[PDB]
Amino acid sequence: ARQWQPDVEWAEQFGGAVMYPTKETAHWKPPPWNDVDPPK
Amino acid sequence: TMMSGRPGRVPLQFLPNEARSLPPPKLTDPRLVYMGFLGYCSGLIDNAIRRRPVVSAGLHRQLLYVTSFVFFGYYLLKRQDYMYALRDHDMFAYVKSHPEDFPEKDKKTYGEILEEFHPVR
């Protein structure tokens, strides 16, 4: 009765570091929201 | 074609003097009308982006967009027509000066030409 729209499950497909994750890139983390890293 | 090296070309002129011997495009040229339409669309999109009444937010701004587009369009049309005139001029001059490379083909009628016939069966 309602037009389907994306949900969180569908949205998380575009949240990774890359599309099509593989074993080598499985440990890749998306960059910080602001382009700043901890100085460590 | 590469008319960049064409002799007697001033390095940075939009319109040479010899282009003034060609008829200027009319003010009701369809291309000028399309350029004005492009300006009007730019005005509408400007109104929409700033979150203003699209049709009737700034009429002075929309008029200025249309005027600028028509201005640049008229001058661009003049330059484009000039360039095509140059291309045709060089074409005809080279054909005239090289009669051996463009021989007159013999005129023949279909009554004495034998073309293969392929029936559709």
Binding site: V18, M19, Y20, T22, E24, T25 | -
Partner: protein, 54 residues
């Protein structure tokens, strides 16, 4: 309905293209970000271009 239309006609044109382009995209974009490898490849390309195109 099943064997040709939903399985093999789908396997031949669309799915093969999708799989091949996905594999090629993964291969091209899987770069470690190390300029060491990039400049070694640059050296290889320079030698190949000198040795092949003349």
């Amino acid at each position: 309905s099943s064997l040709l239309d939903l399985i093999w006609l789908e396997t031949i044109l669309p799915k093969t293209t999708s799989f091949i382009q996905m594999k090629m995209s993964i291969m091209v974009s899987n770069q470690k970000g190390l300029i060491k490898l990039y400049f070694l490849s640059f050296l290889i390309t320079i030698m190949i271009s000198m040795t092949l195109f003349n």
